[PDB]
Structures are given as C-alpha cells and as structure tokens.
C-alpha cells in the first residue's frame, strides 16, 4: 500500500476534451509519394535487382570447413531420393518415366537462379502428378483410337502422344497463371493457411497416394477413377480384384518395404551423427534391379517393369495452345495447390533457422519454372515434403544441393540408359509407401487439439473429411472458407460477465469467481469481450436484459398493473417514474444506474449504434441511467459518424474508466436527496 | 483534484492471485436438465400451445373505438391492391390468372391461423413468380407438343397443364423444405441479413421486375430468358423489337401510369389524415376495364387482354411427386429467398411499434401455407413489401385485415366472373411500375454510406451488382459470404498506436494526437485493437518492430559489426548484452523495456501464442524486457492451455494495467544501479 498514488480529478469526457488540445501532422502530396521513384539511385536499382534475382545476393558467402561437405552429402541424398520416386510420379500420370526425369532435371536449375528459400527441394510431387494423370485420362480416353494408323491388334503410341500434349498444355497454362498471379502481388494470400489446415490437407493427400499406389503394389490392372468419392471407388475396385494377383511382385514389394523400414529405424537408432546417412533408397533400387535382371522376372513370372528408357536429350518444342478452352479450371486448381504447398513448406522451414522467405517471389519463380519446363517437354512441378525434410535433415545450406541433384539426374539420363531397365514397379510402390510414414504420423494432433481447444480440432477434422472423401481442390477451398467462418462463430458467442469491485481499490473483476468481491450498492456492471456489429447485436441486448436481472418491459407492465389495480374508486433524455410508493413495490433490487464496459469492444457499425440508442432510450424511459466506460477513439468516431451524438445530454454519458463512472454515479446520487 | 483517491499496492499478477481465492458454483446433472420437461404442468402446456398456435393468444384483446374502422379500411385497401398485381404476378409465371386468385385467397387464411407478425401481408410476390415462371418455361418448352391431341393448327392447353403441374410440384417441395427447416430450428439464421444487403437485394429485384414488365407494357411478344445475364438479354431483346409495337396499349398504359402518379402525389399532399385514402388502384382497374369494354379494344386494335376467367371453385387434388428429381435446387432457392424477404420485412416492421417476431414460427407457418396451397392448386407465396407497407400505413392492427382481403377475393372469384374479362395488361404493367417507386427511391443510400462508412457502401454495391447482372440466388449467397468476409478484413487491418502518458496522472493516450503527452523515459508502449490469431500474427509483429523503432536484428547486426571492427590486433529467460561501451554505441534512443497493451485483445490461438513467445524470446536475447498489461481471463486461459507458462519467470511478466507495468518497470530499474 505504498505505490500507485493517483489523486486525479474525475475525467468524464468533456472535462478531458477541454483539458487537452489537438495536433495536425498533415502529410503533403497525397497519392503522389511514388512519383519520386524510378530514379537513378544506385542503391534502389541494386535493391531491385537483388529482389528480382535472389541468386546474386546469396552467393559471395562461401565457407569451406563444413559447408562444402554438408552441401555435397545433401545433394547426393536428395538426388538418390528424387530419382526413384520421380520415376514413380511420372508413372502415376500415365506418362513414360522419361518425362519424370525431365521434370527432375529442368526446373530445378531455373529455381536455383530464382528462389528465396534456401532449404526447399523441387520435383514432380505427388498430388500434382495425380491431377495431371486424371486430366490426361479424362480428356484422352483409352478406348478411342484413330483407325488410320498401324491397323495392328494393339497400339499404345498415339494415345501416349495425346496425353503428353495435354499435359504440356496444362503445364503451360499453370505456369502462365502462376506468373500472372506473382506479378499482380497475389502472393500475399498465404496467411490464411492455418497449421491444422495444412496438417489435415497433407494427411488426406498421403492417404490418397497410399490408396492409389496400393493397386500397383499388388500388381493388378484397374481402371482409373477421378472425381467425387474417388478414393472409395479405387479401394473397392482394388479389393474386388484381389484375386488373380501376382505373387512375385507382392513378395519383392514386401521384401523391400521391410528392408526400408528396418533400415530407417536402425539408422535412427544407430550413431550416424558423425558419419553421413547411407542412401537407403538407392541401395533398394539397385538391389531390386539387380535381382530382377538376374532372375529374368519379366518373362519367368510376368511381372510389371518400368520399360524401355530412351537415352539422350530432346530439342525444345512449341506446345499446342488450342486446348486451353477445356483445361483452364484444372490449371487454376493445380497452380493454387502447388503454390499453397510450396509456400507452407518454405514458411515452416524458414522460421526454424535464421530468416524469412518472400511470397510473391516464390510464386514468380515457380511460374517461370513451370512455363519453361512446359517449353522443354516437362509436366508441372511443386515442392515435395519428404525431399525437403531430407535435404534439411542432412546439412543443406543453400540451393546448390539442387544443382548437385540436377547434375546427378543429368548423369543418369545421359549415362546409364540401360541400367535401370529391368526394374519392377513394386519396389517403387514400397519406396513411396515407406516415405509416406512421416505424413502418416501426423495423426497425433487429434488428442492434443482435443485437450487444448476444440476449434482447432474442428478445423482439422473438417479439412481431413472434406479433402479425403470429396475432391482435393473443393476440399481445400471449403476448408479455407470454414477456417474463415470459425472467427465469425467465435465472435458470435462471447462471454457475458457481471463485474464487482474489490474492496477499497479500483479493481473490478468477475463477481462469481473469487469470493471477496461485492456489488456496489445500486449499481450493476456488464462486460462483453466482442465487437458489437450486425451479427451480434440482439444477443448482446438479450444478455444485458437477462444476466443483470433488470427487464424494462417487466417493470413497465408491473407499474401499469399497479396503477390499474390502485384505482378502485428541445429534447429531454431522462424522465423520472411517478409512483404513489406505499406498498406496491415488489421486493427486490434497487438499482438506479447501469455501467457498460467498452474497453474490449474493437469496432461498431450502424446496427450496433441503433441497438445502443434503443437500449439507452428504453432505460431512460423506465428511469435508469446508462453510462459507457472506456470507449476508445475508434468506437467514439463510429458513434459520431452515425446520428448518435445529437447532444441533448448524450455527450456526458461517456467515461474514461469503470471507476470514474462509479464515482460519477455516486456523486450524482449524493447531489440529489442531500442538497 | 479532489476525487479518485486510490493508494493501492502494485498488482503484478501473482500478488493479485495470492490476494484472492476461488469459488466453485458447480452445476449438477449436466446434460439432463431437460429430463424434467414434458411434465403435466398446466402452465408449460399452455405456453407450448400459445407458441405453436399464435391465434389463441392474440384474440381476446378486441376494442371498438378505432380498431374496427382501421382494420376494415386496411382490409379494403389491401384487397383492392392485391387483386390486380396478384393477376399480374400470376400472368408473369406463364400461368392463367385464376391460379393468382387462388394464391391470393388460400394461404392468407392459413397464415392468419399461424403467424407471429401482426402487420405483414401475404400474397404471390414478384421474385417468386419470376422464378416459378422460369422453371416452368425451362422444364416445359413452348415448342414440344405431343401430336396425339387435337391435331389443330395451334394448341395451348396441354402445355398449360404441364406448366401447372410443374409449378405445383415446385410449390410442394418448397413447402416441405420450409417446414423441415422450421422444425429443425433453422430459423435462427436471419441475423446475417444486414440492412444494406437487404436494401441492395430489393433494389435489384425492383429493377428486374421493371425490366421484365416493360415488354408487356409495350405490347410486343418476346421469348423468355432465364439465367446469368438475364436482364441484359431481356432488355436488348425488347429494344431490338421496339418497332411494330401496339399504339393503343402504350397510350392506355401511359394514361393510367400518369393518373396513378398524379393521384399518389396528390394524396400525399392532400389532407387525407382524418379521412381514409381512396383506392387508386381499384379506380384505375375499373376505369381500364370500362374503357376497354366500351371501345371493344380487343378487336378494334388487337390489344392484349387478361382472357377468360372461369367462375367457381375447384376440388382439392393430389400433385405429382415424380418430378422432384429435377426441381430440388430451385425449390431450395425459392424457400431461402422467400424466408429471407418475409423475415426481413417482419423484423423491420416489428421493431417499430411494440413487439418482436419469432423466426422459426414464421418459417413453419410459411411452409404449412405453401404445402397446403400446393394441395389446393396454388403456387408459391411470400411477403410482398408494397402490400405490407400499405397495410401498415393505413391502420391495420392484426391479421384480420388479411381475413377481410380473403373475403374480398372470395367475393371476386365467386361473384364477378365476367366483370374483369376485358382488361388490358397495360394497366397492370403501369400499376406494378408505379408501385415499384418506393423500392426505386432506395438509391438515396449511396451518398449517406459514402459519407458515413465505406464498408457499408461496399456491401451495398457488391450486393446490387451481384444480384442485378448475375442471378438472384447466386447474388444473395455471394453477398452473404462477402458480408461475412468483411469482418475478417476489418480485423485484419487494425490501428497500431504508440501510447504516451498524461503528466502526473495515469491516463495513457495516443502520442501524436493531443500535443501534451510525453513518452516515459526508457519505455515504449504499443497498442493493437484486434484479436491476435492466425490471419493477423505476422502483421502485428512487423508493426511492433517498425512503429516503435526498435528492431532486434538491426541491433544484433550492429553489435556484431562493432565487435568485428574493434578487434584490430534450469532455464534462464533474460541475458544482458556484453559490450566494451566506449564510443561505438549509435546515437539514438535508450529504451530498456517494452510494454504491450492487451485490454483490446479478445482471443488468441496457437499461432498468436507462438508469435508472442518468439517476440519475448528475441527481445530477451537482445536485452529488452517485455511486459503484458491488462490481459483478460480468456487470454490468460488461452496462454495457459498452449505451452507458454512453463514459468522460468514468464508468470511475473503479466500486469493488471499499463500504469502498474510502468511503475513495476521503474521500481525494477531503480533497484538496479542504486542498490
Ligand atoms: O512425397 C509424397 O509422396 C507425399 C504425398 C502426399 C503428401 C505428402 C507427401 O510427402
Ligand atoms: O411488389 C413488387 O412488385 C416488388 C418487386 C420487387 C421488389 C420489391 C417489390 O415491392
């Protein structure tokens, strides 16, 4: 009881207004501040070039102790991881794996020259490949064959060319759309991707990938399904055809699957901190191809194989621009999904070590990479989560690991040629399924969100459900919209409390919470921690009339009944209630004024102003004063703009704090009946 | 300087926590409070019957001085207004006007028995009629004729029966949907219809009605258009065919139009306060039919006529229930639009005089009326704004005016028969166009909303644009969604301010606003009036780092540069910055602590907790204390649920008010370097 001495006069609001003054701080040349730009300043031009060419700024910094070794090992690991699942992703899109090698090689080099994040991997990804394959299958069916060809029993060449052309058109459209969005400053919209939303979306994507690749794991041909309820159709189709499966492919697939799982757990347990982690996937693919070649499994048991792999490089070609009037919506979906995934991964990795990534620059770089890849026979690309985690978890410090991976894939595509020819698809399926474990383990957020807050749990569950059973684009859009309406719900159900004063102090807290706070006699205090706008205006009035226990309509009805039963034989804002006042007053409270807390109110609109005016008018008509405490500048401005401060007396109702309102009410009551 | 004496010790938060105690107030039998319901209490049963049968409660109150006269005149006016525009609305739906008379008669009686609002009119409405006509035309075209009929040159009878059957099926589906929504407590969702949204929607509807009825006014046959860009197609079609028009219909239409306009303005100016307003529309229709009969305009000039009107009553019939698998979406649209319009009108009229209307009860009553009307050959109904305003503006005090209108329309449909036979459609078009003036005048809200607040103006303009050029249902849904996203935008761009202390007091206000507030030496205060959640977490941190002028990264870089240049030859939360401290300190501020205002923050989530933890960690690493002032119970609970209060020292950072934080910082600084 030694500090916090105030001794200050009552500050209603006109008193504080006349106590203060005003400043101007008026800016000049409004709307023309940018007319001084585009000058010959060397610093500004240097900054612009640095912004649009990230490769220039992050390059002189080049140490040799551990940077080179870490970058080299990260490049080795990311290349040996990108090769087999790159082939698998190409194979998932009804396109030969050579285009997967092209997607692994071409755009990585360009993203090295254009890229803000320094720990992100670039490749074919999974969801993008699935959508490309679905579009190619739908637009070019497997039954329509032009008879003016080879006139053989079976021909699967013109169909492949048509699918490639469709994929190229879609990729070019996606790249153009991404570039246009990046230039137009549309990269700002990535803050709406909440963490549970991303977690649920990625878990649903992992489930989709697992279900899709199960059929290749078994080795049974099944027609491709795409659209609403795609996963359930695919799983019922594969379960219906479990019989007549291939035993050899299943056996080798489970063998490599178990080998990968055991090796990963052993490496996690083994003291490989000082050494470099071994390439499990590279060893797996080498062993698989060696066994298949040594046992001649293509004809001994009729197992599926990767097929012939042309050896060389192919000159650039101009893609068709006449199919755009059928593949415009799906291109938008691909661009949106890819941008969201890559920006989420980049932002998650950036906050970890030291820096922050730009949003629009990544979009522009991705669009440039997509367009130029489409120019060089390459389908759409995005950020792959597993490769990014591997690169970060190995020692990568820049995008030079991507360059090393590009050199590795160039060596593969110009040197081996025939080495990766006898490779069963079962090992690829096992590799992808094993890699899916990291995203499968993300189910642990259910109990944590159940314990912490049910809102995040609801967002997670809604995203997972809408992205699993329904489509992927529709799921993402609906999840974002629901992640937005969650805020409206949260502000539509606030916590109404009645305040009480701590003894001989100025602290007002919840009345039914601490057992030693008492109501000020004749005064009731109400608090709402939410803005008062159109969606929340009647609920506030109802809660005020109910929780405090003072209902003006009931008082008016009771008084009218009392008057009826007794008889047996330029602006005024406040009016007293005439009453005979002998014995008809009901036994209850004797509240004379109500104080409203407005410190927690952020904004108000016309509906809120109207409802406050109605509340004030009704309570003045009954005979109870109403005061507002703690109104901020924004709320005062909103009240002034609407026709509220006509000032018969309404300008004197405002107060700076709850204690000021209480003291003003007490002194006003003391001035009456005692003077 | 006489009042407001406090003299209270510093209340950080642990001090206040140990100063207080706790209560329980634990409820019992959670989730079983409703198991005591459905009892034999006479009061509860009486209240339930009153709730589900409004007609019982509001009936004994029956005075005779002015109630009877006002109700009678209101009924007269509403009936004479409902007849001609009822015929016009039936005619707009490609249905004979007899069904319009049925829609005027049948459901009004039932809404009298089921209805909360006591000043609302019931009838066919305009938008509903347009949608019914569009559906009937689309599903049953005007070119498909079954050859197995009369085999005449022209037959327009089976097509009419098909259109009637389609309308009946749609009406039955709408009634069923409305009843199901009303029972399921879905009537709560009407608070999202903001006033500018309703104004813009009604203005767009009025424009649609005017454009649609212009072609009937001219007298030129044109094919009906429905869908996206319907209004522009209709207007270009009617303007393309302005030639070969009918002069007689145009002449009579402008004659009656001018008569109505002049009569309405005269009545507004004339002292008809004591007398009863004359039925302008009834006189207009009487004069029109008299002139048409006396001049034989059907064959003298080939003008369009209402046609033959069968005289009698028709027995109930069971409608087809096999077309529901084509007319389910449009039924939903009709139900939603009708409910929204009627609830908006009822809520606007209810707040005026004395009472409030229920939401679910109106929905249930409307659904019952729609279904039973569909049983008795009646298309969909809703609330008509013009009739409601006329009934309110005449002296109506209950729904008995609807009963009088029902008796009037029964008299018309069983008595006249041949009287309203020679009636040109031009007079109906003029009557509807004249009635549209009230909704056309609603354009005056543009300057008011431009002056008051641009948010309401944006909502108004977006609703008008999306409901005029685009469809009506799509416009309404998109307008509701955009009105919802407005709140997200508003909370995404708050006002960041830096506070300053008034001399020798405890009032802290905007520093650059009043010219006599000074910064506390060595202390900076930041305030944000918005919740800190996922969509607004990085902007808050950036504003805090920029506006205050203390950037931790810049300080770290400068100190590292100084150290580099000088050399020429179980948990700890706060660490001091080691420095040689001779001449390398930059000339600037000397802030030692930062106080964050949290009175205006309503809620927080995981992202906000993470960003506050990051801010605190960074500023502690640099060497600046961070305090939080005014945190509420909800914010404290949100911080506790997430892993924030691990309590190395973080539990002592909280403070009850800004002045408490300032005093604590000052005493903490005084305790050092002086003791
Ligand atoms: O890399 C994959 O196979 C993958 C697929 C879907 C979701 C997350 C992923 O890492
Ligand atoms: O009654 C009408 O004709 C009308 C039509 C559209 C909008 C508002 C209206 O009052």
Coordinates of C-alpha atoms in Angstrom, one line a residue, chain A residues 159-463:
Chain A
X159 CA -2.6 -42.2 -77.1
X160 CA 0.7 -41.5 -75.3
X161 CA 1.4 -38.6 -77.6
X162 CA -2.0 -37.1 -77.0
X163 CA -1.6 -37.5 -73.2
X164 CA 1.8 -35.8 -73.4
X165 CA 0.4 -32.9 -75.4
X166 CA -2.5 -32.5 -72.9
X167 CA 0.0 -32.5 -70.0
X168 CA 2.2 -29.9 -71.8
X169 CA -0.8 -27.6 -72.4
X170 CA -1.9 -27.9 -68.8
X171 CA 1.6 -27.2 -67.5
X172 CA 2.0 -24.1 -69.7
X173 CA -1.3 -22.7 -68.6
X174 CA -0.4 -23.3 -64.9
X175 CA 2.9 -21.6 -65.4
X176 CA 1.3 -18.6 -67.1
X177 CA -1.3 -18.3 -64.3
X178 CA 1.3 -18.5 -61.6
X179 CA 3.5 -15.8 -63.2
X180 CA 0.4 -13.6 -63.7
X181 CA -0.5 -14.0 -60.0
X182 CA 3.0 -13.4 -58.8
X183 CA 3.4 -10.2 -60.8
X184 CA -0.1 -8.9 -59.7
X185 CA 1.0 -9.1 -56.0
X186 CA -1.4 -12.0 -55.4
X187 CA 1.2 -13.9 -53.4
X188 CA 0.1 -12.2 -50.2
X189 CA -2.7 -14.7 -49.7
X190 CA -0.9 -17.4 -47.9
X191 CA -1.5 -16.3 -44.3
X192 CA -4.9 -18.0 -44.4
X193 CA -3.3 -21.4 -44.4
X194 CA -3.5 -22.3 -40.7
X195 CA -1.3 -25.0 -39.3
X196 CA -4.1 -27.6 -38.6
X197 CA -5.5 -26.9 -42.1
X198 CA -2.1 -27.8 -43.7
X199 CA -1.7 -30.8 -41.5
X200 CA -5.1 -32.2 -42.4
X201 CA -4.7 -31.5 -46.1
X202 CA -1.3 -33.2 -46.2
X203 CA -2.6 -36.2 -44.3
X204 CA -5.5 -36.6 -46.7
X205 CA -3.0 -36.3 -49.6
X206 CA -0.9 -39.1 -48.1
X207 CA -4.0 -41.3 -47.7
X208 CA -4.8 -40.6 -51.4
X209 CA -1.3 -41.5 -52.5
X210 CA -1.2 -44.7 -50.5
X211 CA -4.6 -45.8 -51.8
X212 CA -3.6 -45.0 -55.4
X213 CA -0.3 -46.9 -55.2
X214 CA -1.7 -50.0 -53.4
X215 CA -3.0 -51.3 -56.7
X216 CA 0.4 -51.0 -58.3
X217 CA 1.9 -52.7 -55.2
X218 CA -0.4 -55.7 -55.7
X219 CA 0.1 -55.8 -59.5
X220 CA -3.4 -55.8 -60.8
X221 CA -4.7 -53.6 -63.6
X222 CA -7.6 -51.4 -62.7
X223 CA -9.4 -48.5 -64.4
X224 CA -8.5 -45.1 -63.1
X225 CA -11.2 -43.1 -61.3
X226 CA -11.3 -39.3 -60.8
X227 CA -13.8 -37.0 -59.1
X228 CA -16.0 -37.1 -56.1
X229 CA -15.6 -40.2 -54.0
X230 CA -12.5 -41.2 -56.0
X231 CA -10.7 -42.9 -53.1
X232 CA -13.6 -45.2 -52.1
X233 CA -14.2 -46.2 -55.8
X234 CA -10.5 -47.0 -56.2
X235 CA -10.3 -49.1 -53.0
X236 CA -13.5 -51.0 -53.7
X237 CA -12.2 -51.7 -57.2
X238 CA -8.8 -53.0 -56.0
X239 CA -10.4 -55.1 -53.2
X240 CA -12.9 -56.6 -55.7
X241 CA -9.9 -57.7 -57.8
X242 CA -7.6 -59.0 -55.1
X243 CA -7.7 -62.5 -56.7
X244 CA -5.6 -63.4 -59.7
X245 CA -2.8 -61.2 -58.3
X246 CA 0.9 -61.6 -59.0
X247 CA 2.8 -63.4 -56.2
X248 CA 6.3 -62.4 -57.3
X249 CA 5.7 -58.6 -57.3
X250 CA 4.0 -58.8 -53.9
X251 CA 6.8 -60.8 -52.5
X252 CA 9.6 -58.4 -53.7
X253 CA 7.5 -55.4 -52.7
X254 CA 7.1 -56.6 -49.1
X255 CA 10.8 -57.6 -49.0
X256 CA 12.0 -54.1 -50.0
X257 CA 9.3 -52.5 -47.8
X258 CA 10.6 -54.4 -44.7
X259 CA 14.2 -53.7 -45.7
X260 CA 13.4 -49.9 -45.9
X261 CA 11.5 -49.8 -42.6
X262 CA 14.2 -51.7 -40.7
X263 CA 17.0 -49.7 -42.2
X264 CA 15.3 -46.4 -41.4
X265 CA 14.6 -47.4 -37.8
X266 CA 18.2 -48.8 -37.5
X267 CA 19.7 -45.5 -38.8
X268 CA 17.5 -43.5 -36.4
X269 CA 18.9 -45.7 -33.6
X270 CA 22.4 -46.0 -35.0
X271 CA 25.0 -43.4 -34.1
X272 CA 25.2 -41.9 -37.6
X273 CA 25.5 -38.4 -36.1
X274 CA 29.2 -38.0 -37.0
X275 CA 29.1 -40.1 -40.3
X276 CA 26.7 -39.5 -43.2
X277 CA 23.4 -41.4 -43.5
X278 CA 23.5 -44.1 -46.2
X279 CA 21.2 -43.8 -49.2
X280 CA 18.6 -46.5 -48.3
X281 CA 16.5 -45.8 -51.4
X282 CA 19.5 -46.0 -53.8
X283 CA 20.5 -49.4 -52.3
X284 CA 16.9 -50.6 -52.5
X285 CA 16.6 -49.7 -56.2
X286 CA 20.0 -51.2 -57.0
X287 CA 19.1 -54.4 -55.3
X288 CA 15.7 -54.6 -56.9
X289 CA 17.0 -54.0 -60.4
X290 CA 19.8 -56.5 -59.8
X291 CA 17.5 -59.2 -58.6
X292 CA 15.1 -58.6 -61.5
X293 CA 17.8 -58.8 -64.1
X294 CA 19.5 -61.8 -62.5
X295 CA 16.2 -63.8 -62.3
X296 CA 14.6 -62.6 -65.6
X297 CA 11.4 -61.9 -63.8
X298 CA 9.8 -60.1 -66.8
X299 CA 9.1 -63.5 -68.5
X300 CA 9.7 -66.0 -65.7
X301 CA 6.7 -64.8 -63.8
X302 CA 5.3 -61.9 -65.9
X303 CA 5.9 -59.0 -63.5
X304 CA 5.5 -55.4 -64.5
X305 CA 8.6 -53.4 -65.4
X306 CA 9.5 -49.8 -65.8
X307 CA 10.0 -50.4 -69.6
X308 CA 12.4 -49.0 -72.2
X309 CA 14.2 -45.8 -71.3
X310 CA 15.4 -43.7 -74.3
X311 CA 18.9 -42.4 -73.9
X312 CA 19.7 -38.8 -74.9
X313 CA 18.3 -35.3 -75.0
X314 CA 15.4 -33.8 -76.9
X315 CA 15.3 -30.4 -78.6
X316 CA 12.8 -27.8 -77.4
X317 CA 9.3 -27.8 -78.9
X318 CA 6.4 -25.3 -79.0
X319 CA 3.3 -26.8 -77.3
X320 CA -0.2 -26.6 -78.5
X321 CA -2.2 -23.5 -77.5
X322 CA -5.6 -24.6 -78.9
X323 CA -6.7 -26.8 -76.0
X324 CA -6.8 -24.0 -73.4
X325 CA -10.6 -23.8 -73.7
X326 CA -11.0 -27.2 -71.9
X327 CA -8.2 -27.2 -69.4
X328 CA -8.5 -23.8 -67.7
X329 CA -10.2 -24.7 -64.4
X330 CA -7.9 -27.6 -63.6
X331 CA -4.9 -25.5 -64.4
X332 CA -6.1 -23.0 -61.8
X333 CA -6.5 -25.8 -59.3
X334 CA -3.0 -27.1 -59.9
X335 CA -1.5 -23.7 -59.6
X336 CA -3.3 -22.9 -56.3
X337 CA -2.5 -26.3 -54.7
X338 CA 1.2 -26.2 -55.7
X339 CA 1.6 -22.6 -54.5
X340 CA -0.1 -23.4 -51.2
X341 CA 2.0 -26.5 -50.6
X342 CA 5.3 -24.9 -51.5
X343 CA 4.7 -21.7 -49.5
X344 CA 3.6 -23.7 -46.5
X345 CA 6.8 -25.8 -46.6
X346 CA 9.0 -22.8 -47.2
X347 CA 7.5 -20.7 -44.4
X348 CA 7.7 -23.7 -42.0
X349 CA 11.4 -24.2 -42.8
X350 CA 12.3 -20.5 -42.8
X351 CA 11.2 -19.7 -39.3
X352 CA 13.4 -22.5 -38.0
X353 CA 17.0 -21.5 -38.7
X354 CA 17.5 -17.8 -39.4
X355 CA 15.4 -15.9 -41.9
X356 CA 12.1 -15.4 -43.7
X357 CA 11.0 -16.1 -47.3
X358 CA 9.1 -13.8 -49.7
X359 CA 5.8 -14.9 -51.0
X360 CA 5.4 -13.3 -54.4
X361 CA 9.0 -14.1 -55.5
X362 CA 8.4 -17.8 -54.9
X363 CA 5.2 -17.6 -57.0
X364 CA 7.0 -15.9 -59.9
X365 CA 9.9 -18.3 -59.8
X366 CA 7.5 -21.3 -59.7
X367 CA 5.6 -19.9 -62.7
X368 CA 8.7 -19.3 -64.7
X369 CA 9.9 -22.8 -63.9
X370 CA 6.6 -24.3 -64.9
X371 CA 6.3 -22.4 -68.2
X372 CA 9.9 -23.1 -69.3
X373 CA 9.5 -26.7 -68.4
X374 CA 6.4 -26.9 -70.5
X375 CA 8.5 -25.5 -73.3
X376 CA 11.1 -28.3 -72.8
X377 CA 8.6 -31.2 -72.5
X378 CA 8.1 -31.2 -68.7
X379 CA 4.9 -31.5 -66.7
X380 CA 4.0 -29.5 -63.6
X381 CA 6.2 -29.3 -60.5
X382 CA 5.9 -28.3 -56.9
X383 CA 7.6 -28.7 -53.5
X384 CA 8.0 -32.3 -52.2
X385 CA 7.8 -32.5 -48.4
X386 CA 9.8 -35.7 -48.0
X387 CA 12.7 -34.4 -50.2
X388 CA 12.7 -31.1 -48.4
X389 CA 12.9 -32.7 -45.0
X390 CA 15.7 -35.0 -46.2
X391 CA 17.7 -32.1 -47.6
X392 CA 17.2 -30.0 -44.4
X393 CA 17.9 -33.1 -42.2
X394 CA 21.2 -33.8 -43.9
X395 CA 23.1 -30.5 -43.8
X396 CA 22.0 -28.5 -46.8
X397 CA 22.7 -24.8 -46.6
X398 CA 21.6 -23.3 -49.9
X399 CA 20.1 -24.3 -53.3
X400 CA 23.4 -25.7 -54.6
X401 CA 22.2 -29.2 -53.4
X402 CA 19.6 -28.8 -56.1
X403 CA 22.3 -28.1 -58.6
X404 CA 24.2 -31.3 -57.5
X405 CA 20.9 -33.2 -57.8
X406 CA 20.5 -31.8 -61.3
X407 CA 24.0 -33.0 -62.3
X408 CA 23.2 -36.4 -60.8
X409 CA 20.0 -36.7 -62.8
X410 CA 21.8 -35.5 -66.0
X411 CA 24.4 -38.2 -65.4
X412 CA 21.6 -40.8 -65.0
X413 CA 19.7 -39.7 -68.1
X414 CA 22.8 -39.4 -70.4
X415 CA 24.9 -42.3 -69.0
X416 CA 23.0 -45.3 -67.6
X417 CA 20.3 -45.6 -70.2
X418 CA 20.0 -49.4 -69.9
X419 CA 21.0 -49.9 -66.3
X420 CA 17.5 -49.0 -64.9
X421 CA 15.6 -51.1 -67.5
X422 CA 14.6 -54.2 -65.5
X423 CA 13.0 -52.5 -62.5
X424 CA 9.7 -53.8 -61.1
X425 CA 7.2 -51.2 -60.0
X426 CA 6.7 -53.0 -56.7
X427 CA 10.0 -51.5 -55.3
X428 CA 8.8 -48.0 -56.3
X429 CA 5.5 -48.6 -54.6
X430 CA 7.2 -49.8 -51.5
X431 CA 9.6 -46.8 -51.5
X432 CA 6.8 -44.3 -51.8
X433 CA 4.7 -46.1 -49.1
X434 CA 7.7 -46.1 -46.8
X435 CA 8.3 -42.4 -47.4
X436 CA 4.6 -41.7 -46.6
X437 CA 5.2 -42.7 -42.9
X438 CA 6.2 -39.1 -41.9
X439 CA 2.9 -37.7 -43.1
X440 CA 1.0 -40.7 -41.7
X441 CA 2.4 -40.0 -38.2
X442 CA 0.7 -36.6 -38.3
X443 CA -2.5 -38.2 -36.8
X444 CA -1.1 -37.5 -33.3
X445 CA -2.6 -34.0 -33.3
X446 CA -6.1 -35.3 -32.6
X447 CA -5.6 -35.8 -28.8
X448 CA -3.5 -32.6 -28.5
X449 CA -6.2 -30.5 -30.2
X450 CA -8.9 -32.2 -28.2
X451 CA -7.2 -31.3 -25.0
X452 CA -6.1 -27.7 -26.0
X453 CA -9.0 -26.2 -27.9
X454 CA -11.9 -27.8 -29.8
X455 CA -11.8 -25.1 -32.5
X456 CA -8.5 -26.3 -34.0
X457 CA -9.8 -29.9 -33.7
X458 CA -12.9 -28.9 -35.7
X459 CA -10.8 -27.2 -38.4
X460 CA -8.5 -30.3 -38.6
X461 CA -11.4 -32.8 -38.8
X462 CA -13.3 -30.7 -41.4
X463 CA -10.3 -30.3 -43.6

